[PDB]
Amino acid sequence: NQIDLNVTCRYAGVFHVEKNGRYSISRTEAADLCQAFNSTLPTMDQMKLALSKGFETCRYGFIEGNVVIPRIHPNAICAANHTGVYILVTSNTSHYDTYCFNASAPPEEDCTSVTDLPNSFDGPVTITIVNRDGTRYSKKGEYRTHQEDI
Ligand SMILES: COCCN1CCc2cccc(N)c2C1
Ligand SMILES: COCCN1CCc2cccc(N)c2C1
Numbered sequence: 001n002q003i004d005l006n007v008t009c010r011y012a013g014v015f016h017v018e019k020n021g022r023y024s025i026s027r028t029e030a031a032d033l034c035q036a037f038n039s040t041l042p043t044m045d046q047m048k049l050a051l052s053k054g055f056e057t058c059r060y061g062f063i064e065g066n067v068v069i070p071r072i073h074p075n076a077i078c079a080a081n082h083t084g085v086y087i088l089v090t091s092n093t094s095h096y097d098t099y100c101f102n103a104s105a106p107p108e109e110d111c112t113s114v115t116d117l118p119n120s121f122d123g124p125v126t127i128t129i130v131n132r133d134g135t136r137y138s139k140k141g142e143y144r145t146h147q148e149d150i
Contacts, residue, residue, distance in 0.1 A: 002126045005033070007114045008057070009132070013105040014042050014050035015114075016057050018097045023060065029149040030062040030098035036120045036143035039100040040064075046101050047085050053108050060088055061097035068099070117141070 008016040017033060019025050025033065034040055041064040042050070051070045058078035060067050067088040069079040079086035113135040117127060123142025130136050144150050 001124055002128065004128050004130050005117070006130045006132075009055075009109060009111040010102060010105040011050040011053040011055035011109055012046070012107055013039075013102045014046055014055060014099055015039075015102070015105075016059060016061055016097060016099055018059065023096050025062070025098050026095055026149055027062055028146045029144055030096075032143050032145050032149070033098055034100035036117050037100050037102060037114075038104070038119045039102040042099050042101040044068075044085065047099065051085060059097045061099045063099050067091070067096050113137075117143070 004020050006018045006021055019033070031041060041062055043064050044066070047063055047068060047070060051072065054072070056070050056072040058069065058075065060069055069086045071079050071083045071086055074081045074083050113131040113133065114129050115137045117129055117139060120127060120139065120141035120143050124140065125142050126138060127141055127143070128136055128138045
């Protein structure tokens with residue numbers, strides 16, 4: 001009973017989380033996951049500011065209201081070569097990564113490691129935060145509040 005949460009640097013408080021390194025988060029789970037980081041799903045405005053500070057990924061993830069990919073550099077295999085906050089229009093499926101927004105983060109780029117999942121609740125899952133530099137923090141707990149996500 002183990003979950004890896006791979007987390008990025010924060011940019012104006014916005015970061016990306018993937019569960020087990022593959023698209024596997026529903027919209028309800030995404031909200032719960034951000035809540036566990038004392039964070040919320042970003043607004044479009046929040047994501048645009050993060051982009052302006054250097055944030056880009058090659059992953060679809062939830063924000064409030066849409067699924068998006070922030071792009072700075074055009075790449076043919078990431079958001080069909082678009083730049084800016086690319087909005088997913090047409091998809092059959094419901095599971096993506098998520099973005100999260102932590103208002104208490106620094107205003108620009110913060111690439112220090114994440115060492116806590118401060119708002120996880122009691123539970124039986126070994127949850128491991130994995131930073132890009134390999135630094136890990138584990139705890140026993142849970143964050144999913146919807147049964148359909150478990
Ligand atoms: C209100 O949350 C109830 C569900 N949680 C409550 C806390 C908890 C602790 C250890 C194992 C499990 N399964 C659980 C389940
Ligand atoms: C946005 O990056 C998607 C690719 N994955 C690749 C695997 C991985 C491992 C640990 C932390 C992070 N951020 C990542 C990122």
